[PDB]
Amino acid sequence: MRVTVSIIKADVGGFPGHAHVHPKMLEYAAAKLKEAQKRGVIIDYFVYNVGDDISLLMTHTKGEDNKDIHGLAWETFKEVTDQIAKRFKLYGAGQDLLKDAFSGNIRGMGPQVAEMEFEERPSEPIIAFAADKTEPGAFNLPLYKMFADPFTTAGLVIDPSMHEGFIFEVLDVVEHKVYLLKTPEDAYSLLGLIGTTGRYIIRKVFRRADGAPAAANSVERLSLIAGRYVGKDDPVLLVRAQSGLPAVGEVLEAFAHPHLVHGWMRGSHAGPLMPARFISVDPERRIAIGPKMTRFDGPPKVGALGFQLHEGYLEGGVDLFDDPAFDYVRQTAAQIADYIRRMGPFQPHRLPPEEMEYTALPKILAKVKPYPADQYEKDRKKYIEAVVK
Amino acid sequence: MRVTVSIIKADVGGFPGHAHVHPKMLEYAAAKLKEAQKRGVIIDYFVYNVGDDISLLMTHTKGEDNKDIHGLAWETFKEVTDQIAKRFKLYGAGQDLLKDAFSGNIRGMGPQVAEMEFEERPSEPIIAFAADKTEPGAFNLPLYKMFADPFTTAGLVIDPSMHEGFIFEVLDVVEHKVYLLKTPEDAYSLLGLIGTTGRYIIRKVFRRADGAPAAANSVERLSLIAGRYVGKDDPVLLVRAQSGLPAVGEVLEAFAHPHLVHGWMRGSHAGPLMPARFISVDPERRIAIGPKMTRFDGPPKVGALGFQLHEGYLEGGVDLFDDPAFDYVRQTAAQIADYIRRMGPFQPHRLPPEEMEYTALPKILAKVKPYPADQYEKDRKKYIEAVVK
Amino acid sequence: MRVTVSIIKADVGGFPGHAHVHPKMLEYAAAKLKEAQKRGVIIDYFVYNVGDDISLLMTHTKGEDNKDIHGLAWETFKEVTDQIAKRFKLYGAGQDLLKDAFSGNIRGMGPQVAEMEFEERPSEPIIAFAADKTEPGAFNLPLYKMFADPFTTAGLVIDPSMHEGFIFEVLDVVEHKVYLLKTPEDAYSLLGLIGTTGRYIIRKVFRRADGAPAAANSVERLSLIAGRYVGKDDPVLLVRAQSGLPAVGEVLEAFAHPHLVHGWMRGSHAGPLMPARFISVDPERRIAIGPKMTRFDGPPKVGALGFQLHEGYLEGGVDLFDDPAFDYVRQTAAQIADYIRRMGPFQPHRLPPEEMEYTALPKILAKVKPYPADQYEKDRKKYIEAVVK
Amino acid sequence: MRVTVSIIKADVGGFPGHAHVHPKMLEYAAAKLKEAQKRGVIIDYFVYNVGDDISLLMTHTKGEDNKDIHGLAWETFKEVTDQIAKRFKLYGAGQDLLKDAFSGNIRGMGPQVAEMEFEERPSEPIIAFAADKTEPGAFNLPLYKMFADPFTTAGLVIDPSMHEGFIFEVLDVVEHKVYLLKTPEDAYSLLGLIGTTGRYIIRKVFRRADGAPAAANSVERLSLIAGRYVGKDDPVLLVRAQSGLPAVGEVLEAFAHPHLVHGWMRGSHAGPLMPARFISVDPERRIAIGPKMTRFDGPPKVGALGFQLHEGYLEGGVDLFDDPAFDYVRQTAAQIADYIRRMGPFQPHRLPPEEMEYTALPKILAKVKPYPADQYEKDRKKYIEAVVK
Amino acid sequence: MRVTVSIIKADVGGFPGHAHVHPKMLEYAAAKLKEAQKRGVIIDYFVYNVGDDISLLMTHTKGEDNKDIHGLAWETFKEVTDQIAKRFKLYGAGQDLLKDAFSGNIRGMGPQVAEMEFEERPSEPIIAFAADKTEPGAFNLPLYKMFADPFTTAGLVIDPSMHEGFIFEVLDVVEHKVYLLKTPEDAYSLLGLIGTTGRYIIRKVFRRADGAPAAANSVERLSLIAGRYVGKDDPVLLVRAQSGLPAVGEVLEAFAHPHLVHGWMRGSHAGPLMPARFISVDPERRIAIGPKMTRFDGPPKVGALGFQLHEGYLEGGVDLFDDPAFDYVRQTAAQIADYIRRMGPFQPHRLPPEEMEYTALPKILAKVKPYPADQYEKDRKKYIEAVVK
Ligand SMILES: [Mg+2]
Ligand SMILES: [Mg+2]
Ligand SMILES: [Mg+2]
Ligand SMILES: [Mg+2]
Ligand SMILES: [Mg+2]
Ligand SMILES: [Mg+2]
Ligand SMILES: [Mg+2]
Ligand SMILES: [Mg+2]
Ligand SMILES: [Mg+2]
Ligand SMILES: [Mg+2]
Ligand SMILES: [Mg+2]
Ligand SMILES: [Mg+2]
Ligand SMILES: [Mg+2]
Ligand SMILES: [Mg+2]
Ligand SMILES: [Mg+2]
Known part of the structure; x- marks a missing residue:
């Protein structure tokens, strides 16, 4: 059957500050999505945070850009805001609800959206990622690596089914233009764009052999929406794995270098992207509690939950950064964070003047x-x- | 509404030695404060230890220096002493109850007090800190950094709302004199005083733009009270965050260097201040169990609990040193502790002769x-x- | 009495990808073996995974190569496949069931088998090992060390009962030939063979003094079965300890260097063998959940469960890599994994051309x-x- | 007496590539300046490289911006170009000679200039710095620290003669505007400018107590001169030390964190500024050979030569990064360089789009x-x- | 003018064992080439070792594959053998002189040859590399990186002159077949071949924009010449830099990961390729003494000498691994060597069976x-x- 997988994410208040979410917010969201499931609006869901951002992962058969799905997320965020965040006077209550009027699509309103629709494969492994204290371009380097770097994805070389490469749909968020570039041949030009992480963001990736959707990254830029700094974007990302797509481990390998990303304190710094464990994962309650943001409102962190789809049901999530191999990566990130913070408010630890214009x-x-x-x-x-x- | 936040702290016995508290002491204190809440004496509370010191965090509307609040804490400490510490013959039973006669204010009697009264903001994030095996001046370096060091607090530079700086109320605990110094202009003179951590202690910080209370540190010096060494002071500290005050992460950044502080074994050494996780946090029971003191009766440790206030209710606490980024900081502290201990009883590992005069x-x-x-x-x-x- | 200890292992689906197993698969297998125990087919059992491989450890009195035992395992794997893996559309559902027709012995069908039959000693300590993301020859270096390296097994030198050495039964999996070599005298020739880990595999070890069975390693090579790469082999190994056999600690010492092994991503790389803790061990439910495979579908990992046999009953398991001493070993493995991955698809990180011929x-x-x-x-x-x- | 100290620097060819200079270039320059000294054009000199940049340090009594001094440097660079660089076909022969016509001042022609004129003190210690593979703003963080950070310069707090602070002359190289800002009071605003290292550069520092010149940094931006990328700027810096100016060690302390700076490969990256030893220092021949640039055309490096002036004669130079304490700093830089290079051509390792517009x-x-x-x-x-x- | 640059290398005896060369061998070779220069056979030369291999770098105008040049090298090696190696009974006297009869080309006789002929550019920087204790395929990973990995060579992305890519001439040394593959488009197929380092060796690289020669690697395989193991191949490599070819630093960056290579003890192991300093470089005498091979006859090492050509004269050499940044790389190599050696004679530390067939x-x-x-x-x-x- 054909299924749609949608992640719709928003920060509607922090606990304390921008450090984390209140657990009753996740419980409320899960209860609301359970009711939607009972009414047949969605097939399945999972609710989780990384830092102060709540991701609503939903499977359904309504397609991408669907007003009912987008509306269900909006309403859930508004109710969490009103019922929980306002009640406990959480910090940034309703932070990412930037526009008042829901007219059918949540894009441009502040919440982040990543979605894909496909025929569910005989096995359908997917990974949902969420990052806090960074921008959507933080995923540019990992996405490039997992689909185009043979030092990451061995399948590009050694798996005959992958050797034709990938199509990157790159959004210029400033001029509202889309580029379509194909690897391996267009790799250098691709990199010339996506290295400018604040402007040219990988939005979707497709397999070249057949056009199958491979990945979808959320590209909302809160500063361009609001006209001023109101938070970090805090992206979400869906990747389908295996069977002529990168293996689960190739996708994860793409996060094994904790590269410097933009965001961190006040949306105005650069720091390492730490691949973090969840604090807890409860498959039966459909909730995972992700990591806190601490020193300097970070460092930035990414979490990874794996699932297997069946008739759109979500078995999972599985914390995929939960391995002593990744402790080395976290330790590196911790040490790099300490090193770079000794720079204080100087570029390149502080961000360039074009992002500072929003502050x-x-x-x-x-x-x-x-x-x-x-x-x-x-x-x-x-x-x-x-x-x- | 206007709310007062008070931390009143005391060591009334250790388990064993000065290493920790007995958990029934926290349970007793929480039960006593629950009764006070039921009678309308306080709005809310949280009870926790770091090492062998019990902090009573209380929210109420009675103002600073209130005899009822101070008396409630005194009575709680006396009852824990009599009912628990004496019963189990804990070490230093009633340690910090240095005077016999409560006449209305707990200052000068041995317990530490940090309080602030303010109009509760539309979001009111606060952080409560507690340190063991050190003096109130241990917080001088962090307080300076979070309010006056642009390498710590980016908001001083990049947030237009913070750029006017802060007012430090510095207490000379020897001559009983108060200094008021304003940053940035008075930074050098401020440092000339507060670098003498045993004498000139930051007691309160206020925002310069409006006079709002920003921080309150407890300044009781047990040796000056008793006339001899009877313990380390073991301070407590309240900091309000965000919205023209340092971000939660800027406050935490101020503790990311585990600087050398005075105290540790026998109140007579210097060692690194380790930012430590709580062993457990139970928001529903209103209790957190903090870290133990082990090698050499330390090293000194600080714990950080974040809260959000609503109508004076305390949602929290959240352990804010709970991040792999802070593991690096703990590891540094552990290694520095090992290094410095090889000095044995020589200055500067051993303290100067003016503190040794109390031994x-x-x-x-x-x-x-x-x-x-x-x-x-x-x-x-x-x-x-x-x-x- | 005489007892047989059998480990029969298979991957029948991963969660997600090849990262792990679904916990209902272990619960189903344990329930099936509990029924077999009730009917008297087996004495006792333990069910556990490392990565995406399920080991069925069974004690019984039916001897090696027994059709009932082998059939019970086959049936359990087929039922897990049909009932769980297919239902949740797990990745590689039924992965290692390579042949259709069970005719009495599970060898050559895809599942791995290690078994030994012996008179149960007055104390009978045994260790069961399981590795994921590698080949049976990954155990060649540890097996050599624990039975023939005096830098590992002090008993070879200092325990008079061990000094006569061991008999290695080495299988040439390509030409289907068996070598019998005796240490110490044949050590150099032994090494000349078993250093070619993909071809010459230690299958069994016997004590020279009396012929007692000491160890049994599973030697199925999936690529030779299928004629193409369909997974890593993912071996299992039984070792009897003490009393003229290596001590439990000598066996474990043999895994204290996390040596490079073949497998990892796509069966086509080399990486360090990390000795990993189990996530959980539940002796009463007879289930242990082993580690996940993450970066690059690994690194390869081995788990170790110790048991004591009594009348064939299995008291255990005990996680024998659960010691801070082994954290150092895991950290080494983590760092070596990072180092070697920077090579990308070049030998010797990528495997030789004879293994690449299967891809x-x-x-x-x-x-x-x-x-x-x-x-x-x-x-x-x-x-x-x-x-x- | 009054003396002028001038550093006039240029790259006139590399050996090989941009890695280093040819030693005959230094010998030629020293011989030319020896002749100038004999004719009374200058008092004394020292010639040295860091990377591929040749610094001509000259003492004289002709004042700042003097056509004879500037012309002597121009002519020396032109002769080295013609006689040595062209002859050996060195890479970038005449690289920094960007304009054809010397009309009296070398500023705007490509060579870097830092100069100060003062009454020579009863002891006159000075430090000359040269950096390669970076921009003049690379010195912004060190200059801020040594004159305005009490964590660097203890004299701001503890030396009564320094407590009045410093005047920073900041050049906006884009709009050709000068800011004068005074520390401590203007620190936050100062930082808001100079953190934008490519635009707002500290050019001169003066003592506030008396107006004495303290430091002079070279601010030529080759890309703004040429209209396109033709090299890194590669600044030079003079600092006077002691006696109400930062101590030699306070100046050096300002370089003890190897902060990220812009430049490195192709003028398009960010990497750590390594404080490097000279390869050799020959006070009698008046030549020092500085470090090479290797991996990725760097990392960026700074060298420090100390001198004592007497009647304008230069006793020195002394390599002031030559201490095992600085080995730790170099090791940090080496490790940070390795870490950041794994990012490849992604911001913030790659520079922002405003600098990329020059490529x-x-x-x-x-x-x-x-x-x-x-x-x-x-x-x-x-x-x-x-x-x- | 057109110039040919030729490196002709051979081991004609070690001092002691295979550790190093005797310095009189270099002095003899330099004296012989000085005589050739005087007679007009060559323009210029440089003589150096890495380990036990002597490289004769010669510039001349006789073209590639020239009998006079090849003969001059042969004769020099034969005379060093007879006059020095035999006299001092050095180990492996005449080691690489595998055939008796020089018939015009030294290829196939045992010495390694790398040559290129080109129009000398307005600046002509070149780098000569020599490795010991490894095979020609050891240079496959560096060559790939510097010409095809945008994480190494930023110029592929950011320098418009490089963006068309490179042509790799790959030799299959077993079947005597040549592949021509173009990057970026053929990268995956290229890697599928050159990852098999013992079989498919990059021999030459050309710029795609114009066909200019970029690199030449020596591909002689001593075991295929002799029919048995008689030594490691010990390759030499020439790379032209800059101006639409990789920068000197991009070439060097390609060696900054000390990847595992085949060779080391007995031509039968894998170990890290350490980028090593020369012991000494004497540009006037035209001799450099490279590093020794020690533990386990290694680890394998590579040296890098840079030059600038003028009318075919060689200014240089410059040791291009001489930077504290590369100390980190050497330390990594040292630690990896220790780690991997604990494996002893097991694959993948020991080489595969196809190379063992030569032993x-x-x-x-x-x-x-x-x-x-x-x-x-x-x-x-x-x-x-x-x-x-
Ligand atoms: Mg927020
Ligand atoms: Mg967020
Ligand atoms: Mg956000
Ligand atoms: Mg106590
Ligand atoms: Mg205490
Ligand atoms: Mg105390
Ligand atoms: Mg599998
Ligand atoms: Mg497996
Ligand atoms: Mg397998
Ligand atoms: Mg240059
Ligand atoms: Mg330069
Ligand atoms: Mg330059
Ligand atoms: Mg030799
Ligand atoms: Mg050799
Ligand atoms: Mg050789």
Whole structure:
């Protein structure tokens, strides 16, 4: 049968600050989705956080961009906001609900969406990812690696079924333009775009052999929605695995280097992306509690839950960063975080001026006496003597 | 509404030695505060230890320095002492109850107090800290960093709402004098005082833009109360976060370097301040069990519990050192503790002579034959020959 | 009394991918073996996974190569397949069931078998091992060490009862030939064979003093069964300990170096063998849940469960890699995995061409224009100019 | 007496590539400056490289911005170019000679200039720095620290002579505007500017107590001169030490964190600034040979030569990174370089798009078919099917 | 002008064993090449070792495959053999002189050859590499990376002049066939071949834009020449840098991971390729002394000498692994060598059976009693009892 897998995610309040979610928010969301399942709106679901972001993973047969699914998520977020976040006066209550009026699609309103629709395969393993304290382009390097780097994905070389490569759908979020680039041949041009992680984001990946959907990344940029910094984007990502798609382990290998990503404190820094364990996973209650954000509101973290689909039912989730091999990766991230923080507010630890334009900093800087440089050279001695006296 | 948040802390016995508390002490204290809540004396509470010190976190509407609140804490400590510590003959039963007669304020009696009163904000995140095996000045470096170091608190630079700085209320605990110093302009003078951690302690911090209370640190010095060493002070600290105050993560960043602090064994050493996880946190029972003190009666440790206030109710606590990023910090502390302990009883691992004057050491040293140096030079050969024979 | 200990193992589906098993598969298998025990088919059992492989450990009095025991395992695997794996559409449902027709012995059908029959000693400690993401020859180095390396097994030198050495039964899986070699005298020749881990596999070890069975390793090679790569072999191993056999700790010492083994991603790589803890061990339910495979579908892992036999009953299992001493070994493995993965698809991280012949790679390589080298030298300039234009 | 200290630096060819200089270039430059000294054009000099950049350190009494001094440097660089670099066909022969016509000041022509004029103190210690593979803003963090960070410069707190702070002259190299900001009071605003290292560069620092010159950094931006990437800027910096200025060790402390800086390969990356030893220092010949650039054309490195001035004579240089304490710092840099390089061409390892506009990359990216995003959503299936077929 | 650069290398005796060369061998070779230069046979030269292999780097205008050049090298090696190696009875005197009769080309006789002919560019930086204790395929991973891995060579992405890619000439040394593959499009197929490092060796690389020669690797396989193991091949490699070819630093970056390579002890192991400093470099005498081979006859090492060509003259060499950044890489190699050596003679530390066929091992193994496996199963008890008695 054909199934749609949708992740719709939002921050509707933190506990405390931006560190985490309140567990009653997850319980409320799970109860609401259980009711939707009973009414036949969805087939199955799983609710989980990473940091202060709540992901609603839903399987259904309504297709992508469906108003009922998108609306169910919106309503769930609004009810969590009103019933839980406002009640406990959580920080950033309703943070990502950036627009008032739901008119059918949740894109552009603040919540993140990643979805794919496909014929369910004879085995259908999928991985759901969620990151906090970063942007959607944080997934650019992992997505490139798992679909186009033969040092990551051995299948590109050694599995005859994969050797034709992949099609990357890249969104320019500034000019609202889409690029379609094919690996291996277009790898260099692809990289020239997606290395600019804040602008050119991999949104979807398709297999070249047949066009099958392979991955879907959420591309909402909160600062472009709001016109100012109101949070990190905090993306979600779906990847289908195996059988001419990257193995589960090839997908995970793509996260084994905890690369520097943009976000962290105040949406204004760069730090390592730590692949983190969940605190708890409860398959029967359909809830997982992900990691906290601590020093400097991070470091940024990503969680990975694996599932097997059957008739759209979700067996899972399985925490796929739960291995002593990944402890080494977490330790690296911890040490890199310490190293880079000693830079304080200097680029490249602090972000470039184009992202700083969304913060209050240009404000502040607009008290302050420039002097024209040519004239200043003549006057330097008198200006210095004025400061001295 | 206006709310007061009070932490009143005391060691009333250890289990064993000074290593930890007995869990029935926390259960007794929680039960007593539940009764106070039922009678309307307080709104909410949380009870927890770090090492051998019990913190009573209470929210109420009675204001700072209130005899009913202070008295409720005193009575709770006295009852724990009598009912639990004496019964099990715990070590240092009633340790910090240094005076007999409660006359309305618990300051000067041995228990530590940190309190602030404010209009509860639309979201009110707060962090409660407790340290064991150290002095109140152990919080001087973190407090300076989170309110005045742009390498810690990015908001000083990049958040226009924070750029006016902070007012530090510094207590000279020896001469009983208060200094008010404003950052950024007074940073150097501030540091000249607060670097002398045993004498000049940050007691309160206020936002300069509006005067809002930002932090309150407990400044009781047990040795000055008793006139002799009877324990480490073991401070408690309240910090309000976000919205023109340091972010939760900026506050936590201030503890990411496990700096050397005074205390540890016998109140007479210096060692790293380890940011430690709680052993357990039970929000429903309102109890958290903090870490033990082990090698050399430490190393010194600090715990961090975050809360969100609503109508004075405390949602929380959340262990804010619970992140693999902080494992790196704990490992550093562990290694520094090993390194410094190889010094044995030599300064600067052993504390200066002004703190040693509170111990029994001057006693001992007063057997022992000084010779006037000028005369000794003439006589050296005969003295050495006398020792030899 | 005489007892037989049999481990019969198979992968009948993964959760997700090849990462792990679904816990209902273990519960189903345990329930089936409980029924067999009630009917007197077996004495006792234990069910556990490492990665995506399910081991059925069974004690009974039917001897080695018994059709009833082998059939009970086959049937259990077929029922797990049909009832659980197919139902949840697990990945590789029925993966290791390579032949259709059970005719009395499970060898050659895909499941791995290790068995020994002996008079149960006055104390009968045994260790069951299971590895995932590797081949049976992964156990060649540990088996050599525990029975023939005096740097591992001190008993060879210092215990007079062990000094006569051991008999290794080595199977050449390609030519179907058996070698019998005796240590210490034949050590060099033994090593010349078993260093070729994919071809010459230690199948059984016997004590030289009396012929007692000491160890049994499972030698099924899935690629030779199927004629193509269909998975890693994923061996199981039984070792009897103590009393003129290696001590439990000597057996474990043999795994303290996490040596490179063949398998890992796509059966086509080499990586360190990590000695891993079980996630959980439940002696009363007779189930242990072993580790997951994550980065790059590994690294390869081995688990160790110890038991004491009494009248064939299995007291245990005990996780024998559960010690901080082995954390060092896991950390080493984690770091070696990171190091070697930076090689990508180059030998020796990628496996030799004789194992690659079982994959799809020769396929792919057969598009592609060889030129005879002597002729190419004359024509090189024209060929390069053709590519350029 | 009054003396001027001038560093005039240029890359006029590398050996090989951009790795180093040819030693005959230094010998030629030293011989030319010896002749100038004999003719009374300058008092003293020292010639040295870091990487592929040659610094001419000259002491004289001609003042800042002097046509004779600037001309002597220009001529020396032109002669090295013609006589040595062209002869040996070195890479980038004459690299930094960006304009043809010397009209009196070398600024704007490609060579870097840092100069200060002052009354020579009763002791006049100075430090000359040179960095390769980076920009002038690489010195922003060290300069801030040594003059404004009390965690670096203890003198700000504990030396009464320093407590009034410093005046930073900050150049906006894009709009040609100068800011004058005073620490401690203007620290936050200062940081808001100088954290944007490619735009707002500390050019000069003065003591607030008296206006004395403290430091001078070279601010030429080759890309703004040429209109395209032609190299990294590769700055030089002079700092006067002691006696109410930072101690030699406070200046050096400012380089003890090997912070990330912009430049490295192709002027397009970020990497750690390694404080490197000179290969050799020959005070009598007036030549020092600095470090090579190797992996990835770096990592970026800084060298530090100390001198004592007497009547303008230069006693020195002394390699001030030559201490086992700095080996730790180099090791950190080496490890950070390895870590960050695994990112490849992704921000923040790759530089932002505003610096990439100076490279050939926008060129390349301008082949490549954007689709308008709204329309693409309708057409996605047909486009993917077109790629597939 | 057009110039040819030739490296002709041979081991003609070790000092002691295979550890190093005797310095008089280098002095003799340099003196012989100085005479050739005086007679106009060559333009310039440089003589150096890595381990026990002597590289003769020669520039000339005689073209590739020239009998005079090849003959000059042969004669030099024969004279070093006769005059020095035989005299001091060095180990392996004349080791690589495998054939008796020089008939015009040194290929197939044992010495390694890498050559390229080109128009000398306006700047012509080149790097000469030499490795000991390994095979020519050891350079496969570095060559792939520097010409085809965008994580190594940023120029593939960010330098418009490089974006068209490269042509790899791959030699199948077993079947004597040449493959021509173009990156980026043929990367996966390329890797499928060159990952089999002992069979498919990159021999030459050309720029796709114009056909310019980029690199030449020496592909002689001593075991295929001799029909048995007589040494490791010990390759040499020439790479031209810059100006639409990889930068010097991109070439070096390709060696920054010390990947496992085949060779080491007895041509029969795998170990990390350490990028090593030269012991000494003397540009005036035209001699460099490279590193020794020590533990286990290694680990394998590579040295890198950079040059700038002018009218065919060689300015250089410059040791390009001489940087503290590369100390980290050497330390990694040292630790990996220790780790892997604990495996002893087991694959994958020991090499596969196809390389072992060239050693004496099959000899030895051919004493030793196979039993047919089916029959052995019936007889196992009697065979074991026979061994026991
Ligand atoms: Mg939030
Ligand atoms: Mg978030
Ligand atoms: Mg967010
Ligand atoms: Mg106590
Ligand atoms: Mg205490
Ligand atoms: Mg105390
Ligand atoms: Mg499987
Ligand atoms: Mg398996
Ligand atoms: Mg398997
Ligand atoms: Mg240059
Ligand atoms: Mg330079
Ligand atoms: Mg430059
Ligand atoms: Mg040799
Ligand atoms: Mg050799
Ligand atoms: Mg050789």
